[PDB]
Amino acid sequence: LPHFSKDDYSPESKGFVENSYLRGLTPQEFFFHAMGGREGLIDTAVKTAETGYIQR
Amino acid sequence: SLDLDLERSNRQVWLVRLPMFLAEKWRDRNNLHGQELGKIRINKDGSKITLLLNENDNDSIPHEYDLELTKKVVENEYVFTEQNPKKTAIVGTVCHECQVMPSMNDPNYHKIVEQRRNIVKLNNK
Amino acid sequence: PNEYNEFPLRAIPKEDLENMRTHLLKFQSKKKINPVTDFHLPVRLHRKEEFYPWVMEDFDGYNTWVGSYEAGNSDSYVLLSVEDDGSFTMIPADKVYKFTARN
Amino acid sequence: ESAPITAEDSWAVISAFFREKGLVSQQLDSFNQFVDYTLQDIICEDSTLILEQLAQHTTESDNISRKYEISFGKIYVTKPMVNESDGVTHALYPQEARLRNLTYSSGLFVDVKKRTYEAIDVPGRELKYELIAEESEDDSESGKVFIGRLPIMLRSKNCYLSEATESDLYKLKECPFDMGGYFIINGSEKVLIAQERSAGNIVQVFKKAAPSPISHVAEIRSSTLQVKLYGREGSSARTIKATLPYIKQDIPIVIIFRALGIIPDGEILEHICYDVNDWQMLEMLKPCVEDGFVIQDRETALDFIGRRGTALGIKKEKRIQYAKDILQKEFLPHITQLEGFESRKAFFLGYMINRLLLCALDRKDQDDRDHFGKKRLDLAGPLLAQLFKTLFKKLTKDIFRYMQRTVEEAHDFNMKLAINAKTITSGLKYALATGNWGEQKKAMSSRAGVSQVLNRYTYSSTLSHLRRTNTPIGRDGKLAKPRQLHNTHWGLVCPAETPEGQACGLVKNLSLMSCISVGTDPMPIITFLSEWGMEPLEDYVPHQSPDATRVFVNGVWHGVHRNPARLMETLRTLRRKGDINPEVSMIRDIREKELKIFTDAGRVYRPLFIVEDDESLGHKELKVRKGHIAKLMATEYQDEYTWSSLLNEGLVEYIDAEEEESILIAMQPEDLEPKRIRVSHHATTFTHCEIHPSMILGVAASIIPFPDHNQSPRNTYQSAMGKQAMGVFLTN
Amino acid sequence: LEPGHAADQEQAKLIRSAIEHTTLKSVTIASEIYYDPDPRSTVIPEDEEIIQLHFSLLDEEAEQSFDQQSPWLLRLELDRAAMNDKDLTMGQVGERIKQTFKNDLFVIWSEDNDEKLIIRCRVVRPKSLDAETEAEEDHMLKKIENTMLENITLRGVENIERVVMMK
Amino acid sequence: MTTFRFCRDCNNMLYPREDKENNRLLFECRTCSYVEEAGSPLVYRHELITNIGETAGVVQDIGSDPTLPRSDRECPKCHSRENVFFQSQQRRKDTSMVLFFVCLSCSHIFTSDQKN
């Protein structure tokens, strides 16, 4: 992410959310959480159709 | 129209690169009659060269520019002339390579760069 | 350090440039070639307007150079001819040709 | 008054931004660019039409050869208006178009001039034509030939709504809460959704799995060139071959250099490799030299080329000339088209194969195909330019055909009869109404869904619809990577809001501050760049200076340079001081010693702040101060000092998704000085700041409260369901 | 594995070596194609020690065939670790199968005790070769060297890329 | 390590040849009459696996890259405590995570792995 420095391997820089839903998410971990959710959304949206074909 | 004139080709010739606008302004035919239009000044160390335009010219052009050296030694470049099969005549061998840039001291630089802005805005694609 | 030398800037009139059409003659080599020794005078230069490339052949035919026109040289070069008074006269550049030696 | 900045000032600046630009500015600006500039150039491309009728030699009086010349001039555009069946003409307003099922459009007027040349056809002699008749009605209003009707997008420069005040909008009965940005076709509102495309003029290196002999590929699109490297890693046999257009068999690279004009073998490697010491580079190039050394002749390669053409049995010399012309006509057209630019093409081919071989030596990786900096967005403007070019070409072809037909009968043609003005109008109306982006005959294979009917269910639904982009990949295509969210979407795309189903990830919605570039000329940039100390590519010798920065402009190499740091500082000084418009992008890559300049159209950019080192405070700080914020408040309450005032003073900067690779941004301003858990970032060389993180969200998700306390799919679901609520879609 | 060898790691590693596919290109840290104009003596001191070993250890037939050795060499600097990993003895595996296959490549080889495992692979051809053929030394030998590295199997079974131990 | 040699006449690379009556190696240009005497029996070399130590790559003007991190380690030569540090810029899969430090003043390269 443009806010980091080159060759950074710290956990907070590689997608670690140390906050909670009661506390609140900072922007970067919010972005990483968004990608994590997008993966499962795609999973459902397509593998519905593939499983349908196999079932038929 | 076959032989080459090398009797006066021994003298070294400068290789200077002029800016497009300055070079085009110097292609004027009326000023080609051997008129003294400018002068050069060389530093003692030779690192800084200043081209000063003579006051005989119009005040619409900057009268000061600076020169930078590209290669300290320049080899395998020759200057020739061809006149009326055509008769060719070598002029000399190239000695140094220099490039012209506008001088900051002369305020007219800004003016021409202002004209450069005038060039930038009008044309579109 | 402010000592400088004086070279007046002169030019060549139209009457001389009308019958004197200039062409930049460039030779491709890794060695300092000079026509005093590497060319046996006289030399035969011909074209065998830019469709026919230039051919410069020696009297004995040992030194044959073929020259082609390279276009798009956006740098409009100038020729600084030294006169008897030490002044420099400007000559505009018309065309540039690059020469290569025959195998 | 020299104090730092608080988030309140951030919201002040954002308020100014929306008070200056608007939420639909991109469509309006693309349409204005198209109407003002591109329309003229599309006709000026093909101004001259020529008919050369030779003498039939039937009789002596039929020995005269004729030439007919047709030329075009200016373009004039009227305000929209309609002519009823009675022939009466009255200005058309959107209310009448809506209620009466009309089409909001205007008329186009073009100047036409005609010339006739006649020559005496003497056999064995060149025809010498002379000017005899020239019809040009520029001095009369009859010279303006009516050519067709063009639809107009609402609130654009031509439309009557552009300068209407609130009382003007009420008496004409507008909603003041309407923004424009849509056409009225057949009495229904249409909109064009942005279309995503992969950029051109960029060399890309790919890789292959190895059941096949292929090992690496280098692609460029300008016409396509493929320079492939065949031979597995570690083997003795190395092959590098190029695939030229209209040549099937393909021929090696050393043959290309020989045919191109570089005969000596030693110069080949100076063209390819720019570091003398490296031996692996030359080791991989050895077999190319060995194979290409056998033939020192261009003409064998040209004979190779000549055989593979459709025509067979051609004489050798004609094949030589044909293969010679192929190089300057169709080989890398994006560099140049005219004769005599061979050094540039040779060096560019060397650079391409150098990059391929570098990737082949594991010093770098494959190019990422998902990087959002290598993608352009086509708005209404470019699409209209495409269709207008096609239709104008067909119309002028039809004019030429009819004029030839009437010449065959020796009848004078009326210019007002040869033109079928219905072609342009019918084609444009059909394309905008149906959406099939192509000719009526070939609409089946054309792009679809480009034009959609505006959604007025709720106001936020209209807002979300006028800000939508489509990625034209098969929505049943199983490529997962284009669907997923990518690291380059930060701040330019809303992460929450995306459809569900087959269009998941493929349909994108911009954030509140991701604009798009219009387009600008690269010629002044190149002229200035050569002015300030750039050595041309013709006079470049690798060995004299092997530590030279390369300089690119829109993907064509123009030469090298020696001291780039001061050039970058001066260029950014001029960009920040208004000498160049800030839509131009200028990146420098230190590791590879490269400069890249982009001035094309279709790049998404967002605003950012500027960090400069203040010595009086002893550390870095923003250029913005409390005085500027006070001026902004004064101007906003007075509703001067606007957003462009900030832009031209070097206080903010527009950054695209490519320059972002070489910057550092402090997200909160207080992070620049030396509940939740916020960590102090170790950086101390900051260059920009985030105006506010909230703007990384679109328009749909800007209504959820406390969105960060929610699971992300929940934010997506509400961003979907926010377009089905019932409410006042318009106040009229 | 077998019931007896199941509990011990050593027989397991012997079997693992006996199963995996081993080829020459995998076992040479430098299978370098070098010029070998006169194999009698060299400039490199390291191979000089190996020279006199076999030059005092070659049969009369090898003395006659001295001239058959190619004007180029497959000079094999062989990695110690890779050679010892597959339990590969230098002499037997290096030469028995290789010369038995087609009687194509003879070798001057050292015992494993030298610090640098250097093999000199010199192909063997009849002197009856044609003059045009004999002139094109490099042309035959590069091709046969590639066919040598790629198409010689020292030990193992085909198509099995890797074999791995597990508990 | 075999090096390409170019003919002095037409810059073409020299091909090897043998001299049977003197039994000596020569380099000849197939286009001209130039022949030069070989100085070593080493003409070609084909290594297989590269035992190359990882390199920091281009170093010139690396201190002006503002996306590169910093450290307070002390220079072994000029005794300065400001420098730039980065991982190996060669992109092999199996490269270790060994750092590289470039000093700010003397532009000296060193590593964090001080193996004797």
Residue ranges making up the domain that contains D406? 23-180+380-437
Same domain assignment for residues D295 and D326: yes
Same domain assignment for residues D4 and D67: no
Question: Which conformational region is residue D418 in: left (phi greater than 0), alpha (psi within -120 to 50 degrees), or beta?
Answer: alpha
Cβ distance of D538 and C73 shorter than 8 Å: yes
Q: Which two tokens stand for residue C86?
A: 């030490």
Cβ distance of B123 and D535 shorter than 8 Å: no
Question: What does the alpha-carbon distance between residue F61 and residue D592 come to, in Å, rounded to a whole number?
Answer: 12
Q: Which among D354, D360, D363 is positioned nearest to D203, based on CA atoms?
A: D354
Question: What does the alpha-carbon distance between residue B99 and residue B119 come to, in Å, rounded to a whole number?
Answer: 23
Interface-testing mutation among F64, F67, F89, F91, with chain A (most A C-beta atoms within 10 A): F67
Same domain assignment for residues D87 and D133: yes
Same domain assignment for residues D425 and D453: no
Same domain assignment for residues D494 and D506: yes
Question: What does the alpha-carbon distance between residue E70 and residue E117 come to, in Å, rounded to a whole number?
Answer: 20
Q: Which two tokens stand for residue D491?
A: 């701040």
Task: Provide CB contacts within 8 A for D502, sequence distance 6+.
Answer: A45, A46, D475, D476
- φ and ψ at B106, to 5 degrees? -75, 120
Report the DSSP pairing between strands D49-53 and D194-198: unpaired
Interface-testing mutation among C28, C30, C62, C102, with chain F (most F C-beta atoms within 10 A): C30
Question: What does the alpha-carbon distance between residue D268 and residue C63 come to, in Å, rounded to a whole number?
Answer: 24
Query: Which DSSP helix (H) or strand (E) runs through D305?
Result: helix D298-307
Q: Which among D728, D558, D82, F13 is positioned nearest to C74, based on CA atoms?
A: D558
Which residue ranges of F make up the annotated binding site for Zn(2+)?
Answer: 7, 10, 29, 32, 75, 78, 103, 106
Same domain assignment for residues F35 and F89: no
Query: Which DSSP helix (H) or strand (E) runs through D509?
Result: strand D507-509
Report the DSSP pairing between strands B87-102 and B78-83: antiparallel
Cβ(D380)–Cβ(D26) below 8 Å: no
Torsional sign, CA D470, D474, D475, D479: negative
3-state SS class at E45? helix
Question: What does the alpha-carbon distance between residue B15 and residue B98 come to, in Å, rounded to a whole number?
Answer: 6
Question: What does the alpha-carbon distance between residue D514 and residue D606 come to, in Å, rounded to a whole number?
Answer: 5
Question: What does the alpha-carbon distance between residue B88 and residue D477 come to, in Å, rounded to a whole number?
Answer: 69
Cβ distance of D235 and E142 shorter than 8 Å: no
Residue D207 pairs with which residues in a beta bridge?
Answer: D216
Experimental method, per PDB record: cryo-EM
Q: Residue D534 has what DSSP assignment? A: P
Q: Residue D241 has what DSSP assignment? A: E
Same domain assignment for residues F16 and F29: yes
> From start to end of B20-122, where are the E strands?
38-42, 49-53, 64-71, 78-83, 87-102
Cβ(D485)–Cβ(A34) below 8 Å: yes
Distance from CA of F11 to the nearest CA of C (A): 9
Same domain assignment for residues D41 and D156: yes
Cβ(D149)–Cβ(D161) below 8 Å: no
Q: Which two tokens stand for residue D49?
A: 């039409």
How many C-beta atoms lie closer than 10 Å to residue D7's C-beta?
A: 13
3-state SS class at E52? helix
Task: Provide CB contacts within 8 A for D601, sequence distance 6+.
Answer: D376, D382, D516, D517, D518, D519
Instruction: Say if residue D666 is exposed, middle or buried (CB neighbours under 10 Å; 0-12, 13-18, 19+).
Output: buried
Residue B64 pairs with which residues in a beta bridge?
Answer: B52
Same domain assignment for residues F56 and F112: yes
Query: Which DSSP helix (H) or strand (E) runs through E50?
Result: helix E45-55
Decide if B114 touches D, using CB distance below 8 A: no
Cβ(D526)–Cβ(D558) below 8 Å: yes
Report the DSSP pairing between strands D652-656 and C78-82: unpaired
Cβ distance of B6 and C36 shorter than 8 Å: yes
Q: Which two tokens stand for residue D198?
A: 């992969």
Same domain assignment for residues D69 and D145: yes
Question: What does the alpha-carbon distance between residue D303 and residue D299 come to, in Å, rounded to a whole number?
Answer: 6
Cβ(D611)–Cβ(D688) below 8 Å: yes
- To which residue do tokens 């045009």 refer? E132
Cβ(D203)–Cβ(D218) below 8 Å: yes
Decide if F92 touches D, using CB distance below 8 A: yes
Same domain assignment for residues F66 and F23: no
Q: Which amino acid is at A17?
A: V
Cβ(D205)–Cβ(D448) below 8 Å: no
Q: Which residues on chain E are in Cβ contact (under 8 Å) with F20?
A: none
Which CATH number does the domain housing residue D271 bear?
3.90.1110.10
In whole angstroms, what separates CA F83 from the centre of its chain? 24
Question: In b/e form, how buried is each residue of D448-462, taking b as 16+ CB within 10 angstroms?
Answer: eebbbebeeebbbbb
Decide if F59 touches E, using CB distance below 8 A: no
Q: Residue D213 has what DSSP assignment? A: S
Count of pairs with CB atoms under 8 A, one residue in E, one in F:
38
Chains E and F touch (3+ CB pairs under 8 A): yes
Q: Measure the N-to-C terminal CA separation of chain C; round to a whole number of Å.
A: 53
- φ and ψ at E109, to 5 degrees? -130, 145
Q: Which two tokens stand for residue D184?
A: 């009225």
Chains C and A touch (3+ CB pairs under 8 A): no
Q: Which among D727, D166, D694, D706 is positioned nearest to D462, based on CA atoms?
A: D727
Same domain assignment for residues D186 and D252: no
Question: In b/e form, how buried is each residue of E109-130, taking b as 16+ CB within 10 angstroms?
Answer: bbeeeeeebbbbbbbebeeeee
Q: Which residues on chain D are in Cβ contact (under 8 Å) with A45?
A: 500-502, 504
Q: Residue D359 has what DSSP assignment? A: H
Decide if D71 touches B, using CB distance below 8 A: no
> What angle is formed at CA A21 by the lines to CA A20 and CA A27, rounded to 5 degrees?
80
Q: Which amino acid is at C74?
A: S
Same domain assignment for residues F57 and F24: no
Interface-testing mutation among A16, A43, A46, with chain D (most D C-beta atoms within 10 A): A46
Decide if C91 touches B, using CB distance below 8 A: yes
Question: What does the alpha-carbon distance between residue D142 and residue E155 come to, in Å, rounded to a whole number?
Answer: 94
Q: Which residues on chain E are in Cβ contact (under 8 Å) with F16?
A: 35, 138
Cβ distance of C70 and D530 shorter than 8 Å: no
Which CATH number does the domain housing residue F9 bear?
2.20.25.10
- φ and ψ at E105, to 5 degrees? -135, 120
- To which residue do tokens 């067979």 refer? D312
Q: Residue D276 has what DSSP assignment? A: S
Cβ(B23)–Cβ(C76) below 8 Å: yes
Q: Which among B22, B24, B113 is positioned nearest to D574, based on CA atoms?
A: B113
Same domain assignment for residues D222 and D254: yes
Question: In b/e form, how buried is each residue of D94-106, taking b as 16+ CB within 10 angstroms?
Answer: beebeeeebbbbb
Report the DSSP pairing between strands D89-91 and D49-53: unpaired
Question: What does the alpha-carbon distance between residue E132 and residue E124 come to, in Å, rounded to a whole number?
Answer: 18
Instruction: List the subunits that have 3+ CB pairs under 8 angstroms with E.
Output: D, F
Question: In b/e form, how buried is each residue of D116-128, taking b as 16+ CB within 10 angstroms?
Answer: ebebeeeeeeebe
Same domain assignment for residues D205 and D354: yes
Same domain assignment for residues F38 and F79: no
Residue ranges making up the domain that contains F26? 2-46
What is the C-alpha radius of gyration for chain F, rounded to an integer number of angstroms? 23
Q: Which two tokens stand for residue D710?
A: 């929610």
Q: Residue D665 has what DSSP assignment? A: E
Q: Which among C89, C92, C93 is positioned nearest to C11, based on CA atoms?
A: C89
Which residue ranges of F make up the annotated binding site?
Answer: 7, 10, 29, 32, 75, 78, 103, 106
Cβ(D561)–Cβ(D548) below 8 Å: yes
Q: Which two tokens stand for residue D189?
A: 């509102």
> What angle is formed at CA D604 by the lines to CA D599 and CA D610, rounded to 5 degrees?
85
Question: What does the alpha-carbon distance between residue F33 and residue B14 come to, in Å, rounded to a whole number?
Answer: 39
Same domain assignment for residues F52 and F42: no
Instruction: Say if residue D534 is exposed, middle or buried (CB neighbours under 10 Å; 0-12, 13-18, 19+).
Output: buried
What is chain C's percent helix, strand, coil content, to nearest 5? 10, 40, 55
Peptide bond into C42 cis (omega under 30): yes
Q: Which two tokens stand for residue E80?
A: 């110690």
Torsional sign, CA B4, B10, B15, B21: negative
Cβ(C85)–Cβ(C7) below 8 Å: no
Out of E29, E36, E138, the one facing F49 most closely (by C-beta) is: E29
Cβ(D707)–Cβ(D496) below 8 Å: yes
Q: Which two tokens stand for residue D420?
A: 């079928």
> From start to end of D393-481, where are the E strands?
451-453, 468-470
Cβ distance of F41 and E32 shorter than 8 Å: no
Q: Which residues on chain E are in Cβ contact (under 8 Å) with D234?
A: 25
Same domain assignment for residues F8 and F63: no
> From start to end of C5-75, where are the E strands?
9-11, 23-27, 44-47, 54-57, 64-69
Task: Provide CB contacts within 8 A for D487, sequence distance 6+.
Answer: A1
Same domain assignment for residues F6 and F38: yes
Query: Which DSSP helix (H) or strand (E) runs through D432?
Result: helix D422-434
| Helices marked H in B1-125 | 20-26, 108-122
Q: Residue B55 has what DSSP assignment? A: T
- Distances, alpha carbon D573 to alpha carbons B18, D551, D567, in Å: 25, 19, 10
Question: What does the alpha-carbon distance between residue D318 and residue D331 come to, in Å, rounded to a whole number?
Answer: 19
Question: What does the alpha-carbon distance between residue D556 and residue D562 come to, in Å, rounded to a whole number?
Answer: 19
Q: Which among D369, D366, D364 is positioned nearest to D480, based on CA atoms?
A: D369
**Beta strands across the sheet bearing D188-192:** D183-185, D188-192, D451-453
Cβ distance of C71 and D261 shorter than 8 Å: no
Out of C1, C4, C21, the one facing B82 most closely (by C-beta) is: C21
Angle between helices D316-330 and D253-260 (to 10 degrees): 100
Rounded (10°) CA dihedral D352, D358, D359, D362: 180
> What angle is formed at CA C78 by the lines to CA C76 and CA C81, rounded to 5 degrees?
170
Q: Which among D29, D596, D516, D581 is positioned nearest to B120, based on CA atoms?
A: D581
Q: Which among C43, C82, C30, C36 is positioned nearest to B76, based on CA atoms?
A: C30
Cβ(C23)–Cβ(C31) below 8 Å: no
Same domain assignment for residues D92 and D32: yes
Rounded (10°) CA dihedral D129, D130, D132, D135: 80
- φ and ψ at D376, to 5 degrees? -115, 155
Q: Which two tokens stand for residue D403?
A: 């004029």
Which C positions 16-75 lie with beta carbon below 8 A of chain B? 17, 19-27, 29, 32-33, 35-36, 39, 41-46, 75
Cβ distance of C29 and B82 shorter than 8 Å: no
Same domain assignment for residues F12 and F55: no
3-state SS class at D279? coil
3-state SS class at D562? coil
Domain count, chain F: 2
Cβ distance of C25 and B78 shorter than 8 Å: yes
Cβ(D12)–Cβ(D625) below 8 Å: no
| Helices marked H in D473-617 | 523-531, 564-576
Count helices and strands (H / E) in chain D.
20, 31
Residue D149 pairs with which residues in a beta bridge?
Answer: D107
Q: Which amino acid is at B54?
A: N
Question: What does the alpha-carbon distance between residue D359 and residue D279 come to, in Å, rounded to a whole number?
Answer: 16
**Beta strands across the sheet bearing D652-656:** D515-516, D604-609, D652-656
- To which residue do tokens 């462009």 refer? D644
Same domain assignment for residues F55 and F12: no
Count of pairs with CB atoms under 8 A, one residue in C, one in F:
3
Instruction: List the subunits that have 3+ CB pairs under 8 angstroms with C.
Output: B, D, F
Resolution of the coordinates, Å: 4.6
Cβ(C43)–Cβ(F24) below 8 Å: no
Question: What does the alpha-carbon distance between residue D183 and residue D104 come to, in Å, rounded to a whole number?
Answer: 7
Long-range contacts of E137-146 (CB under 8 A, 24+ apart): E137/E70, E137/E71, E137/E72, E138/E72, E138/F16, E141/E33, E141/E70, E141/E71, E141/E72, E142/D236, E142/E33, E142/E72, E144/E104, E145/D236, E145/E33, E145/E72, E145/E74, E146/D235, E146/D236, E146/D237
Query: Which DSSP helix (H) or strand (E) runs through D136?
Result: strand D130-136
Cβ(D505)–Cβ(D488) below 8 Å: no
Same domain assignment for residues F53 and F109: yes
3-state SS class at D223? coil
